[PDB]
Amino acid sequence: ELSFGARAELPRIHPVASKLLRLMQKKETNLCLSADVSLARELLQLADALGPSICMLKTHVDILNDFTLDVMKELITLAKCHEFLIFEDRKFADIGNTVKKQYEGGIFKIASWADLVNAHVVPGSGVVKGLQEVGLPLHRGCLLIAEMSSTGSLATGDYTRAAVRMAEEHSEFVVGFISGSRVSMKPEFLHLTPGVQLEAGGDNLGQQYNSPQEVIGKRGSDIIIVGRGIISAADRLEAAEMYRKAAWEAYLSRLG
Amino acid sequence: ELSFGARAELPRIHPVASKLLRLMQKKETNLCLSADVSLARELLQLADALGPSICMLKTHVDILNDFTLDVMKELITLAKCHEFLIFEDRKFADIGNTVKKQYEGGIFKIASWADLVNAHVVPGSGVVKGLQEVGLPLHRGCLLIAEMSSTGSLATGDYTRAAVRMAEEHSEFVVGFISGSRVSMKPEFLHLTPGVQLEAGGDNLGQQYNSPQEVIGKRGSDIIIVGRGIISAADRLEAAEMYRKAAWEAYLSRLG
Ligand SMILES: O=C(O)c1cc(=O)[nH]c(=O)n1[C@@H]1O[C@H](COP(=O)(O)O)[C@@H](O)[C@H]1O
Ligand SMILES: O=C(O)c1cc(=O)[nH]c(=O)n1[C@@H]1O[C@H](COP(=O)(O)O)[C@@H](O)[C@H]1O
């Protein structure tokens, strides 16, 4: 097993994955903040304060009540300053012809500001082909959703294997997975795991939680994605530091 | 087998399904226009001219370069005038806690103007439970994506059966399916089929076409969803009438 810094140099590494792995190693963080807020001011204040603690800030642009492209310009300034990627968790899941337009155009112009997006594999590989026709020219990366944290997820067995094959066949654009575990044996691919809290539990709408030690240490994932475990805490900076230290030590203990 | 008008009266019918089935029968249309345009003015001019020919207008709000809520107000005026439902093809596909926010909030406020939305079943039933928390109080309906038109679709076999079970267990909110065929034997549920053109073919990003006679007549679906077969034609009104007459006669001939 290689360090994040060594994985950043692998021959087949995607440039977006390399940039991410280098700043993970530099900053000792494998934490992705899930910035699940409705106010631009709260999004930007979290990005500024937690920027030094995170490798990535994950957005849902479509729940921002006061979205503008100028908000995303301000988020990019903070991403550059503090060194983290922006990941829009849009979960593209339509035919290729439609997702290309949803990625490039409309009000959000996601491809203009998002380093990473993700896609469901259920429509077949046309979803990746459509996205990559916008994303490749804009030097972007994509994550495929191989496993899901929610109760009743159908992303198991042959479905997960299909996601891994689709990723490994589109490595010019696909840089990794949303998964609960290591699903690819190829170290060029990133594994990002949501459904993470320090305490056991879930929510009222099918979310299930596992700890950073479980998902990074035992299940072999790379990055934890944490929303409410940080966002709902009073001191979001201290909460981010507790999640960062948990995920980082779990990673170190698997390296030996 | 019952007529659309008789299905509108079934004991377990959802009010949104009933409204749709009644206007389908009244207007002799089982055509859904897929209004896949980037300009509000073109969306509204198509809605006005084709309104009499359609039972439903399907949107992708996130590809409208000049979206505002006022555009949606004008679309509702046309939907009420010409009698068609508005279906936002958002393909919700996240955990329940996230999709509730994506449906009610952000800049689109989809639930405020969309009679129907749809969801992927891959996250498990929490996706439906999250949507229904917003949609039930707003008297809305939902379609579950049981089958997809695109090459390499994983929505087959056990996946399709899981979509039907999830629909039949959430009948207070789920009114039918996106499918290529009749997938439920319960006549209360609507079947809407995209991937429809009069001529054989596909696109360059995995779309596959079947004819109205094939999907309504042979495969037993209720409604055809047609985008480019109409939108790319010079005369979109005549194209809509061709598709309407094809789908309507296929329905009548299955009825006998
Ligand atoms: O793609 C995602 O990040 C995602 C995938 C998944 O399997 N489960 C999952 O919870 N998510 C997202 O990750 C975040 C989880 O947030 P919390 O449950 O608050 O920590 C939400 O924004 C979800 O939309
Ligand atoms: O839910 C949908 O309508 C959908 C499901 C599916 O299986 N395939 C599919 O093409 N669609 C949508 O239906 C429309 C098909 O458009 P055309 O290929 O131009 O007729 C697109 O807007 C798609 O996003």
Query: What angle, rounded to 10 degrees, do the helices at A126-135 and A96-104 form?
Result: 30
Q: Nearest C-alpha to atom 16 of ligand 2 is from which residue? A: B227
Q: Distance (Å) from the C-alpha of residue A10 to the closest C-alpha of chain B?
A: 30
Residue for token pair 């840089």 = A175
CA distance B16 to A90: 28
The tokens for B156 are: 């087959």
Pick from B45, B46, B100, B37: which is nearest to B66 by CA? B37
Tell which atom from ligand 2 comes closest to the C-alpha of B229: 20
Per-residue tokens: B157: 């076999």
* Cβ proximity of B198 and B169 under 8 Å: no
Residue B96: CB within 6 Å of ligand 2?
A: no
Distance from Cα B227 to the centre of ligand 2, integer Å? 7
Q: Is B70 a catalytic residue?
A: no
Contact B63 A106 (CB under 8 A): yes
Which residues in chain A are closer than 8 Å to B105, comparing Cβ atoms? 38, 63, 65
* Beta carbon pairs, A and B, within 8 Å: 175
Q: What is the resolution of this structure in A?
A: 1.1
Smallest Cβ–Cβ distance between B125 and the set A102, A149, A206 belongs to A206
Domain coordinates of chain A in residue numbers? 4-255
Task: Judge whether A197 and A229 are in contact, CB under 8 Å.
Answer: yes
Q: How far apart are CA B151 and CA A125, in angstroms?
A: 8
As a whole number of angstroms, the distance between CA B166 and CA B121 comes to 8
Rg of chain A taking only CA atoms, in angstroms: 17
Q: How far is the CA of A96 from the centre of ligand 2 (A)?
A: 10
DSSP state of B120: E
Length of chain A: 256
Can you tell me the distance from the alpha carbon of A232 to that of A235, in angstroms, rounded to the nearest whole number?
Answer: 9
Give the nearest chain B residue to A107 (CA atoms): B65
Tokens of A30: 């494998």
Assess contact for A5 and A25: CB atoms under 8 A: yes
Nearest alpha carbon to residue A225 among A168, A147, A160: A147
| DSSP classification of residue B62 | G
State the virtual CA torsion across B206, A95, B173, B224 in degrees, nearest 10.
Answer: -60
Count of CB atoms situated within 10 Å of the CB of B233: 14
For residue B53, the SS3 value is helix
- Superfamily of domain A4-255 in the CATH hierarchy: Aldolase class I (3.20.20.70)
B73 is catalytic: no
Q: Return the closest-CA partner of residue A136 out of A39, A14, A9, A1.
A: A14
Tokens of B61: 């709000």
Catalytic member of B91, B109, B129, B245:
B91
Catalytic residue among B27, B89, B100, B115: B89
Dihedral angle sign, alpha carbons of residues B99, B104, B109, B115? positive
Q: How far is A131 from A250, CA to CA, in rounded Å?
A: 33
**CA-based nearest residue to A87, from A76, A95, A96, A99:** A76
**CB spacing of A150 vs B126 below 8 angstroms:** yes
Give DSSP secondary structure letters for chain A.
Answer: ---HHHHTT-TT--HHHHHHHHHHHHHT--EEEE---S-HHHHHHHHHHHGGG-SEEEE-GGG-TT--HHHHHHHHHHHHHHT-EEEEEEEE-S-HHHHHHHHH-TTT-HHHH-SEEEEESTT-THHHHHHHHHHTTTT-EEEEE---SBTT----THHHHHHHHHHHT-TTTEEEEE-SS---S-TTSEEEE-SB-SSS-B-TTSBB-B-HIIIIIIS--SEEEESHHHHTSS-HHHHHHHHHHHHHHHHHHHH-
**Cβ neighbours of B89 (radius 10 Å):** 26
| Chain-centre distance for alpha carbon B49 | 19
